[PDB]
Amino acid sequence: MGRILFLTTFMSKGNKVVRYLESLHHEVVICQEKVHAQSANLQEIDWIVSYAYGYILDKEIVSRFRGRIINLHPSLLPWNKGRDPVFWSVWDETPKGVTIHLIDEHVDTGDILVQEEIAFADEDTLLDCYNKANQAIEELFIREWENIVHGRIAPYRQTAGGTLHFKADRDFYKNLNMTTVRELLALKRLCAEPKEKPIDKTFHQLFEQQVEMTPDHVAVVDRGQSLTYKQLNERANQLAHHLRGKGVKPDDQVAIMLDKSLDMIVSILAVMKAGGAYVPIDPDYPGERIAYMLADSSAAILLTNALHEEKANGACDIIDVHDPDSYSENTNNLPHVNRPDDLVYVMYTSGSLAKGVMIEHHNLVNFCEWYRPYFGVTPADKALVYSSFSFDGSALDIFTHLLAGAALHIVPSERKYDLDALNDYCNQEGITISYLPTGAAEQFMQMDNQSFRVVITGGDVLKKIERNGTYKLYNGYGPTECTIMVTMFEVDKPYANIPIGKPIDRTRILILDEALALQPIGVAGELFIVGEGLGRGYLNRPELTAEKFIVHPQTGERMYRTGDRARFLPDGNIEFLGRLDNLVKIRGYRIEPGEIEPFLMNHPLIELTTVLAKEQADGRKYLVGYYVAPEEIPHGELREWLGNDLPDYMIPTYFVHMKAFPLTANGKVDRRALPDVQELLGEDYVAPTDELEQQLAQVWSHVLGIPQMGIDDHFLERGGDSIKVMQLIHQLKNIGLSLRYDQLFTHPTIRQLKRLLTEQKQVNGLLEPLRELDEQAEYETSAVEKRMYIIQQQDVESIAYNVVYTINFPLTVDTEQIRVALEQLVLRHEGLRSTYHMRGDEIVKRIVPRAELSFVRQTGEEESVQSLLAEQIKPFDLAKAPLLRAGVIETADKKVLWFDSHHILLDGLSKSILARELQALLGQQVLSPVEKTYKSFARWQNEWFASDEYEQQIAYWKTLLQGELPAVQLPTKKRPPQLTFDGAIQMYRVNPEITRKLKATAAKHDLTLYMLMLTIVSIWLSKMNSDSNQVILGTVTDGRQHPDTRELLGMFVNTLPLLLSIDHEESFLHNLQQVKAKLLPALQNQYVPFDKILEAARVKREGNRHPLFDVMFMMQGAPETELESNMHHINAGISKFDLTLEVLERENGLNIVFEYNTHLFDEGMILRMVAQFEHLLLQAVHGLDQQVKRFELVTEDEKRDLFLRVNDTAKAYPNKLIMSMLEDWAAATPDKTALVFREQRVTYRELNERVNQLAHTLREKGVQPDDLVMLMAERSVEMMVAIFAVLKAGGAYLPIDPHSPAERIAYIFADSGAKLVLAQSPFVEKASMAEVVLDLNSASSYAADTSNPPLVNQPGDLVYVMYTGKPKGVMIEHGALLNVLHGMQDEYPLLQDDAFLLKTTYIFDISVAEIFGWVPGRGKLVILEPEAEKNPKAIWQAVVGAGITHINFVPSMLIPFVEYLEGRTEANRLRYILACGEAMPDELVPKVYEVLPEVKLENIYGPTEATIYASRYSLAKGSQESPVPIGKPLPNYRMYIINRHGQLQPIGVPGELCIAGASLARGYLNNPALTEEKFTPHPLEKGERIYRTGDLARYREDGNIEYLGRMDHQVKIRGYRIELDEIRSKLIQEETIQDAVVVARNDAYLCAQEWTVGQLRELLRRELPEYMIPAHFAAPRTELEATLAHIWGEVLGIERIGIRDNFFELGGDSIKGLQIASRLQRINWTMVINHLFLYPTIEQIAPFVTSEQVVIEAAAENLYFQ
């Protein structure tokens, strides 16, 4: 032992490490603050252990305790030294690990003691990586601390190079903690600084270079006149000489007021050559505007003519461009005075006076030097100067193409607006490339153009892509402040939101938040531009330039504040989402009107769309949808068209039809000339006509929050939920009318609702208030409160039903104001002051006046917040208040408020109420005191349980949940024997777009979003349950039966079992309506407690699963407060059920949370399932009229992973047929041993020559290719001589067992119709009814010619016909046999020194692998004596004597061969024992490797219709494979597992195995019907055939297939499939291995050296589920067991309970355990309820618990009053 000073600052004081040190009987002194060398915290201490310790230790301390200071750093030092190490281990892509090192004078550079390499998953979030890393360094310390303190570990120095980081180095990569590793590394590439050459040129320099390259090329074309490059250059130099002499210096602002002409191009280049920048002034601008631009530009010279000279009013030195005295005689290039950082132009932006944007030379050059190579601009191109020279569009028109040698065509403003004339000019002049603004483009795309090859657009949101031309379409984005454009996208596909593209050269785009921090990919934010497009700024306006042109506080880079919202897509392109301020609020919903335009244009008749937001003086804002179409479209039609996938507040109130959209002169839609409309409520508004219709409309207005409802307005499509329907019903009770929850979906408008209720009379008393209970000592609990109490008492140390939520606050929030407000809520709500105790056998509640809240204040870092939180999640004692612990973890950037409650208090609605009231109290707002208490509701409901309605509702579940309920066997792992509540979480986010389509679809078809998701979940579960027609799942309801309990803090949620049906042969919409028809009756009987529902159903209690259902589907509405939207639910590693799906509406989308049992599902299994749910969800929302059968579960990524891991087996194999190999080999090695029968040896030559003779004798009998001759012979050399001779002649051999009954051979005589029969002498008389019968033992049936007969067979000719219920003839071709032989030879090679054993009967295909397995490789075939296959002695004698290396065994016959060999030590040459014919016992693998080491046991599978084999799995000496897979396909084999509808099944889901490839059979002989049934073409093979095996099989994660039995011989007990092999193995593992086999009989029931009677059930109970226990195969001892029998019997209701009786079998539940424990406490016995689940028998549990509470009698006995 020794004293240890534990130094931690951002970790806790009670960590696993400290407690482990205390467990070793150490004294751990913990200091969370600074320590000075003279601090008493440094005396008598032997070690110093640091762990997330802020502050650096003093120098004297490091030297004084040298070798005794130990730090726990969560990194693989030397990598990521310092702060935030785990995050930097990912972002900098460094090695991952953890290090226990020594402390030196520097930051984590000391010598290492131990180090471990941890691995992060790409799909793990950063927070997941933090927990994994911090746990690894803690467990490593627990593992090595003793080896350190005892000096058993030698410190080693660090490998040289690594990384160091500090505290503020992550303040930009925040907001990224929930982002996965792959998505983080992607955002890195998409937003990290790339490595390029700078710009050392100006435009005139580059233009003067191109002028020398294409001097005589036409440069500008105005009217019919033209100008070449040299002529343009010389005319500009003349004017620039005159300008520079007048007094133009760099950074001057010479203005130009000319119309589009040649003189404009000359003028522009003259200013730049002189040295200045040109300020374009439109000659048509107002006079005051012209003067402002001149005054602001500070221009002394004006380049105008005589038409626009008087528009200056003596404002500058006018230089007429038509006066010859304005041009010099110098046509030589001027001397250069400019720099790449000089102004080139100043264009003004009238964003409403204008602002002069200043652009420099290097900005334009970077754009021009990118434009030319991007679009391939050649000197052969033609572009038009379309845009006015007062906009940056003309810069792209003029400057980008002049640097490429192209020709500019000046567009007269007389045209330009006539897009028909522009298409003419473009066609008759061959214009190839140009830039058209968005509005003009979308109108030009309706023109027949053949000249353009590239058309670029940009300015407004581009939507239309359908064009009448062969030109490529490009979309661009960019503000004038950043040159012209910064991103470019090629419009290839149709897009809803056409991307603005990827950044251009020397330009980087960043999507940031309001704090200028990096947003994750997909999350929107402000577009920030960085690169060589950023100009100097605004002219004479430095304040605004500092506002938009900012330097980054963390990157030091100059950025432009675009003010636009955008998001990065995964591909790399940027998607424009709108302006950050142009968001309008319609019906209280902030929307972007531009999101509606793509849906309206998708209408078949609308070709142009623009949605505008207009306002009325009253305040209300309305959307107007302007559309261009051939004629008008009905208003309702447009409301229907948008209603298919848009909510109501985004459906415009008014629609305006237009012939053509007005365009501004800039090329954009006018958006101000668009006609106006008019306070009307629309055309679909029908006002109430009766008193009841107005009464209902006001109730509808109150619930849905919409004023002036319509008679034909749909409740669900205007915001109605389930709670809104129940509100409507309750508000109608106050009126006096009764509406059922189902009648709303059948009457979803006020019109129909009136017709239903107008015949009803107002009844009083329909809504009774809740009576407030008078003051009492104790209060009775509710049924759900009792149930939560019963659950917690099973394991009184469980956190499964603990409710943890965290909220991240800014550091400005007073931590005490939170505590104060939380302490107010403890007073306001009696639930926070309620304590639950037990009075006898009754659970009661007691309210306490005041309770003390636990508010722990801590300090932590980002990589410790979770582990600081995880230790605060401790069990609750339901007898102690406040039942809610809280606290605040303060980091350097946030304050994490946390609280932990119990589900007996905090349900879903209680969390929303608590967040609402905390946000009010934190806002210093008043809180009107509460009015009702949970004690009142409990009494109300406990009384309602004795009503008549309750008896009606309990009959619904008794008449429904009784019978053989559905069985959902999800593809899980092996179910643990007990119950596991260990779990994890995976999340799937549905984007806001699909979320709208899901909601709009549900509303359109009288459904809620919950009903729609429930069907998708039901279909998802059904398809995983082998396409079941019925499923069972669970859900949760609010449980607020009395309407006065919606503001109370308590547990109300009730659990409902949902029995649903899915018809795969019908549409999604059909199943959607039938799901509603099964949910609504359940919601009408929803208030029966779940424990009573189970009892009424008379359900089992199988310990491997949960009652009634195993999967739960929950849905919570959107957050009502902002404090609620910023809350985070914590799982803490608990899964209450096998799988839970919760759909949470967050941020206009859907966050679907997958809570799963970690013992039943892996991370990869869940990742496949969340991807399959998305696959079905997208398939369904886009396939409503489609049948559910046509939806596929497997994803394209799973289809391609299954191919690569399984069906990628193609390998080119030689086409030399097996006969030609015997010829080729015999000629090479003629006297080498080929056959060995008994003690005689045949050589290749002897075999070949003997085979040749019988071949010639066969040819003269009419043996032609694809002719069949039957064989009746036993194991001999003649059989081998026969078989090979059949093939040499050209035919195929048909094996016929010679000892077959005459009826069988007659059948195969008829079906084959074959005439020839090669038989042995004892069987010639059996072939009596043939034609040509030859005795193989008579030299008459042989000939003299030892010559090899000619080759007459082709790779597609039949080689044998194996017969298999009347047998059928499987026809096998040559190349089929050649492929399985080459594959087996490539896998299990038989070489020259190796051999085979002929032991399988030739009426079995496995024999063929022995008949021919030796020919490739030139081995030998030892022919086992006939009937010796049953004698393992004779078998063994052969392998030892002949050196047999390849042997085939049926698993049943390998058992007697593994025996006998037990003990024998004779040497062996065996190499492969290939097993096939039946399922391999899991116990045989070790038995084989024990008796015969060095052998390689291999399990092979293959039907006769796939030659011989098809799949193989190599068993290893590890002996750990319980499934015993049949394996993966062989070379050029492909296997598929399909469902009942022909779809590929995913991993784990069972289906029918199917085969495909080269070694497939040609078909059944004389049975084309069966050939068409079992050999079918399939889209998986692209029209090629597949063989239906008829065997059930499942895919494994490895890829190896598992044999599940024949589909027509499948055993199912109560729906669940039975694996009878797993039953026998669990029965054989005992000592008495009688090896009894289990089989199923029908009465359907399972039946199967010890007097085991019913005790074997107890053995098969702790390993197998009750549905896989074979049905057919009182002695209380002490006073304790005698007592236990009485309490059990009295509670369970059973008489004479004996020990060794299963408590749960006797009807036990977690409720009856609490009763049994309660009765036992009053007699001072102590039983733990969890022990009942571990020791379900009395003799088992009586010692393992049932301790006594010691009673004493003393203290003060005698008193003496002095």
Ligand X SMILES: *P(=O)(O)OCC(C)(C)[C@@H](O)C(=O)NCCC(=O)NCCNC(=O)CNC(=O)[C@@H](NC=O)C(C)C
Among all residues, whose Cβ is closest to ligand X?
1710
Among 78, 1107, 1119, 1349, indicate the residue that binds ligand X (CB under 6 A): 1107
Binders of ligand X in range 1642-1681 (CB under 6 A): none
Shortest Å distance, C-beta 1022 to ligand X: 22
Residue tagged 């394991």 (tokens): 795
Shortest Å distance, C-beta 1714 to ligand X: 9
Shortest Å distance, C-beta 1079 to ligand X: 17
From the list 905-913, 1042-1050, 1321-1329, 1661-1669, the region that binds ligand X by CB under 6 A is: 905-913
Shortest Å distance, C-beta 1607 to ligand X: 35
Nearer to ligand X, 576 or 805 (CB): 805
Nearer to ligand X, 1482 or 1705 (CB): 1705
Shortest Å distance, C-beta 931 to ligand X: 23
Q: Does 911 bind ligand X (CB under 6 A)?
A: yes
Nearer to ligand X, 1140 or 1445 (CB): 1140
Q: What is the distance in angstroms between the CA of the first residue and the CA of the last residue of the chain?
A: 54
CB-facing half-sphere around the CA of 1257: CA atoms within 13 A:
25
Q: Does 1711 bind ligand X (CB under 6 A)?
A: yes
Asked if residues 387 and 363 have their Cβ atoms less than 8 Å apart, the reply is no
Q: Does 803 bind ligand X (CB under 6 A)?
A: yes
Number of residues that bind ligand X (CB under 6 A): 21
Among 84, 597, 863, 1709, indicate the residue that binds ligand X (CB under 6 A): 1709
Shortest Å distance, C-beta 1058 to ligand X: 12
Q: Does 416 bind ligand X (CB under 6 A)?
A: no
Q: Does 902 bind ligand X (CB under 6 A)?
A: no
Nearer to ligand X, 649 or 981 (CB): 981
Shortest Å distance, C-beta 996 to ligand X: 24
Among 1036, 1285, 1362, 1618, indicate the residue that binds ligand X (CB under 6 A): 1036
Q: Does 1311 bind ligand X (CB under 6 A)?
A: no
Backbone angles phi, psi at 1578, to 5 degrees: -140, 145
Asked if residues 48 and 133 have their Cβ atoms less than 8 Å apart, the reply is no
Asked if residues 1603 and 1591 have their Cβ atoms less than 8 Å apart, the reply is yes
Nearer to ligand X, 1079 or 1141 (CB): 1141
From the list 5-13, 1018-1026, 1680-1688, 1707-1715, the region that binds ligand X by CB under 6 A is: 1707-1715
Binders of ligand X in range 539-568 (CB under 6 A): none
- In 52-111, where do the E strands start and end? 69-73, 81-82, 98-102
From the list 254-262, 903-911, 1564-1572, 1646-1654, the region that binds ligand X by CB under 6 A is: 903-911
Nearer to ligand X, 1036 or 1380 (CB): 1036
Shortest Å distance, C-beta 1672 to ligand X: 28
Q: Does 1317 bind ligand X (CB under 6 A)?
A: no
Among 520, 533, 594, 908, indicate the residue that binds ligand X (CB under 6 A): 908
Q: Does 1037 bind ligand X (CB under 6 A)?
A: no
Asked if residues 32 and 9 have their Cβ atoms less than 8 Å apart, the reply is yes
Burial class (CB in 10 A: 0-12, 13-18, 19+), 606: buried
Binders of ligand X in range 767-796 (CB under 6 A): 787, 790-791
Query: What three-state secondary structure class fits 69?
Result: strand
Q: Does 1055 bind ligand X (CB under 6 A)?
A: yes
Nearer to ligand X, 399 or 898 (CB): 898
Residue tagged 């009384």 (tokens): 943
Please give the C-alpha separations between residue 535 and each of 272, 487, 873, 1162, 1204, in angstroms, as whole numbers: 17, 16, 55, 54, 52
Per the omega criterion (within 30 degrees of 0), is the bond before 1736 cis?
no
Q: Does 1621 bind ligand X (CB under 6 A)?
A: no
Nearer to ligand X, 525 or 1057 (CB): 1057
Partner residues linked to 1067 by β-bridges: 1187
Asked if residues 316 and 255 have their Cβ atoms less than 8 Å apart, the reply is yes
Q: Does 1023 bind ligand X (CB under 6 A)?
A: no
- Among residues 1059, 1055, 1082, which one has the least CA distance to residue 1136? 1055
Please give the C-alpha separations between residue 471 and each of 375, 436, 445, 491, in angstroms, as whole numbers: 12, 13, 10, 11
Nearer to ligand X, 1153 or 1680 (CB): 1153
Q: Does 1710 bind ligand X (CB under 6 A)?
A: yes
From the list 346-354, 725-733, 902-910, 1631-1639, the region that binds ligand X by CB under 6 A is: 902-910
Shortest Å distance, C-beta 1038 to ligand X: 9
Shortest Å distance, C-beta 1050 to ligand X: 11
> What would the DSSP string read from start to end of 390-442?
TSHHHHHHHHHHHTTT-EEEEPPTTSSS-HHHHHHHHHHHT--EEEE-HHHHH
Q: Does 280 bind ligand X (CB under 6 A)?
A: no
Nearer to ligand X, 530 or 832 (CB): 832
Nearer to ligand X, 790 or 1287 (CB): 790
1703 vs 1418: CA distance, rounded Å: 68
Q: Does 1155 bind ligand X (CB under 6 A)?
A: no
Q: What tokens were used for 1148?
A: 């206009």
Binding mask 848-887 for ligand X (x = CB under 6 A): ----------------------------------------
786 vs 377: CA distance, rounded Å: 79
Shortest Å distance, C-beta 1692 to ligand X: 13
Shortest Å distance, C-beta 1166 to ligand X: 18
Dihedral angle at the C-alpha atoms of 1396, 1402, 1403, 1405, nearest 10 degrees? 30
Shortest Å distance, C-beta 1180 to ligand X: 25
Q: Does 1732 bind ligand X (CB under 6 A)?
A: no
Q: What tokens were used for 1756?
A: 């003060």
Q: Does 1136 bind ligand X (CB under 6 A)?
A: yes
1622 vs 1616: CA distance, rounded Å: 14
Please give the C-alpha separations between residue 409 and each of 225, 228, 426, in angstroms, as whole numbers: 10, 12, 10
Shortest Å distance, C-beta 1637 to ligand X: 35
Q: Does 1094 bind ligand X (CB under 6 A)?
A: yes
Q: Does 1010 bind ligand X (CB under 6 A)?
A: no
The runs of H, that is alpha helices, within 1605-1670 are 1620-1628, 1655-1659
- Among residues 1248, 1212, 1215, 1225, which one has the least CA distance to residue 1357? 1215
Nearer to ligand X, 527 or 791 (CB): 791
Q: Does 903 bind ligand X (CB under 6 A)?
A: yes
Asked if residues 221 and 401 have their Cβ atoms less than 8 Å apart, the reply is no
Asked if residues 1438 and 1469 have their Cβ atoms less than 8 Å apart, the reply is no
CB-facing half-sphere around the CA of 1339: CA atoms within 13 A:
2
Asked if residues 1348 and 1223 have their Cβ atoms less than 8 Å apart, the reply is yes
Q: Does 1053 bind ligand X (CB under 6 A)?
A: yes
From the list 367-375, 906-914, 1235-1243, 1424-1432, the region that binds ligand X by CB under 6 A is: 906-914
Dihedral of alpha carbons 1452, 1458, 1461, 1466, sign = positive
Q: What tokens were used for 1300?
A: 């077959």
Nearer to ligand X, 344 or 904 (CB): 904
CA 1352, chain centre distance (Å): 57
Q: Which residues bind ligand X (CB under 6 A)?
A: 787, 790-791, 803, 903, 907-908, 911, 1036, 1053, 1055, 1090-1091, 1094, 1107, 1129, 1136, 1142, 1709-1711
